[PDB]
Design a protein around this ligand. Structure first.
Ligand SMILES: N#Cc1c[nH]c2nccc(-c3cccc(O)c3)c12
Length: 258
């Protein structure tokens, strides 16, 4: 029962990079939100930019001495990680719908010149109608400003989800990195397993993929239509990799399902 103004901080929803996330229920109105309890300057700044239905909304913040409190839209359906059954995945029509929503959120972000940099199932939250929302902007950054792109140079993210250029290049474009990670998420949805620990030539599973050994897992679990899309996303050269406009033209992406 701590509190901040009208909100009771009722239960922990988890830890992130830094900072607990609590469920905050308002004593008066009964509204429920999520509150992150904690560089931060930049995060808040990016958070106030966000206005889209597949992105977690920012409601405002309050600094109270030591601790900053970031109020955000609650997603009470848990995360996509909870929907992925190990070694199985989920039904292809659920995967497709979530992938559609993830692409809508990522397009939006990239359109305001923001890169998330850590797309993975734990950061993809569901609302009570199973709508997907991209959350956690603690690693997010600006890659386009006044219509000029800047390349990134900090390595960050989560190894299984990161694009290979991030481990090999001094500087790289933001957008193909976020596309690659969506590809790994789509793999996980359809196969219930990640394909490699990291995308280095010293990792055997990655070498196998580049040699097109799709008779192996996880690829053997995936139907040929989504697998053809994954062949276009998980492309090692970032300038050859498919872009989001072209993902939206892909045959599996447009296939009627369920
Ligand atoms: N962050 C955040 C959240 C924003 N709305 C939420 N709704 C439910 C859970 C979370 C949440 C909780 C722990 C870790 C995390 O990554 C996200 C959030």
């Amino acid at each position: 029962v701590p509190f901040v103004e009208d909100w009771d901080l009722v239960q922990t929803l988890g830890e992130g990079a830094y900072g607990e996330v609590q469920l905050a229920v308002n004593r008066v109105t009964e509204e429920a939100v999520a509150v992150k309890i904690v560089n931060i300057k930049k995060e808040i700044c990016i958070l106030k930019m966000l206005n889209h239905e597949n992105v977690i909304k920012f409601y405002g913040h309050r600094r109270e001495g030591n601790i900053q409190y970031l109020f955000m839209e609650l997603a009470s359906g848990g995360s996509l990680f909870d929907r992925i059954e190990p070694d199985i995945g989920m039904p292809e029509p659920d995967a497709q719908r979530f992938f559609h929503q993830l692409m809508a959120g990522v397009v939006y972000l990239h359109g305001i010149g923001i890169t998330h940099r850590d797309i993975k199932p734990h950061n993809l939250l569901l609302d009570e109608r199973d709508n997907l929302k991209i959350a956690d902007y603690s690693l997010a950054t600006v890659f386009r400003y006044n219509n000029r792109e800047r390349l990134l140079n900090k390595m960050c993210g989560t190894l299984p989800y990161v694009a290979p250029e991030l481990l090999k290049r001094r500087e790289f474009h933001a957008e193909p990195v976020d596309v690659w990670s969506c590809g790994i998420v789509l793999t996980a949805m359809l196969a219930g397993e990640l394909p490699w620990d990291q995308p280095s030539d010293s990792c055997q599973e990655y070498s196998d993929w580049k040699e097109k050994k799709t008779y192996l897992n996880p690829w053997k679990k995936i139907d040929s239509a989504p697998l053809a899309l994954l062949h276009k996303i998980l492309v090692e050269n970032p300038s050859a990799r498919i872009t989001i406009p072209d993902i939206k033209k892909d045959r599996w992406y447009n296939k009627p399902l369920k």
